[PDB]
């Protein structure tokens, strides 16, 4: 189907405790495949998936070099942003960046990304046209002016249409055993009495990949969106994900409730009920 490659970066200053900590991770879809942590004993880009391990030593040297360089630029950027926002040097601040590309089933570029946040708030974002910028405030406008001057967007566009798509393609082939396999959810409904008058029906989805999933309850065919407790999709730790949805049900009305599951590992959407 469709696929994505994404690189995430976080720098966190810690005045009085050394230089800002830099952590970057790379993903294909929901599979972590590389990481770099400046606090590691001997910081290097490290493999986190079997299909990337075959890349040669020059690959790992290059990616390590790029990450170290990004850690350095983030550190001077954090000093710059203190100036832009008239902030003291006493506090801890955060710079986050994500970039990457989405491709369709034919491997063609669907769209690219490159966007920043400072202290958890949107800072500057490359627009979908891969040629213009959206700056969140007058500080980010200074970055925009600099990046327009240096034609940064044109560099990014070339990468996002070029290497990003080409290497995602390469990774998808080398890890086709896993990257191109969807694991459907294993599903069941459980029943937990609350009182003489009510019980909880909990619809479970377990062991699925990728993370995207739709879990809903209907009562008499009506969506129960407002009354459904829906937990965040969570990692199991073994590449797969978990999710549940729960409704509180008057006793004796269990059979009016149906759980509905959509997932790309399922040929057809599922319907399930409490089975006493």
């Amino acid at each position: 189907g469709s696929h994505s490659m994404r690189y995430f970066h976080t720098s966190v200053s810690r005045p009085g405790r050394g230089e800002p900590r830099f952590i970057t991770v790379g993903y294909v879809d929901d599979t972590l495949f590389v990481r770099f942590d400046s606090d590691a004993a001997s910081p290097r880009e490290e493999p986190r998936a079997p299909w990337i391990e075959q890349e040669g030593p020059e690959y790992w040297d290059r990616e390590t070099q790029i990450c170290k360089a990004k850690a350095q630029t983030d550190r001077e950027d954090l000093r710059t942003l203190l100036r832009y926002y008239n902030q003291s040097e006493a506090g801890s601040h955060t710079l986050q960046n994500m970039y990457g590309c989405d491709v369709g089933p034919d491997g063609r570029l669907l769209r690219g990304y490159h966007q920043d946040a400072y202290d958890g708030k949107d800072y500057i974002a490359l627009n979908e046209d891969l040629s213009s910028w959206t700056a969140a405030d007058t500080a980010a406008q200074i970055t925009q002016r600099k990046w327009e001057a240096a034609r940064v967007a044109e560099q990014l566009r070339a990468y996002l249409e070029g290497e990003c798509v080409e290497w995602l393609r390469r990774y998808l082939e080398n890890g086709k055993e896993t990257l191109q396999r969807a694991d459907p959810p294993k599903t069941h409904v459980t029943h937990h009495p609350i009182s003489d008058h009510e019980a909880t029906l909990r619809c479970w989805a377990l062991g699925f990949y990728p993370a995207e999933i739709t879990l809903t309850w209907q009562r008499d065919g009506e969506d129960q969106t407002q009354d459904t407790e829906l937990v965040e999709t969570r990692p199991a730790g073994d590449r797969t994900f978990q999710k549940w949805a729960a409704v509180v049900v008057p006793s004796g009305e269990e059979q009016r409730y149906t759980c509905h599951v959509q997932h790309e590992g399922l040929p057809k959407p599922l319907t399930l009920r409490w089975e006493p």
Partner: peptide, 10 residues
């Protein structure tokens, strides 16, 4: 593979 042009400062 990462974007590897010379990094541009904010």
């Amino acid at each position: 593979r990462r974007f590897s042009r010379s990094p541009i400062r904010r």
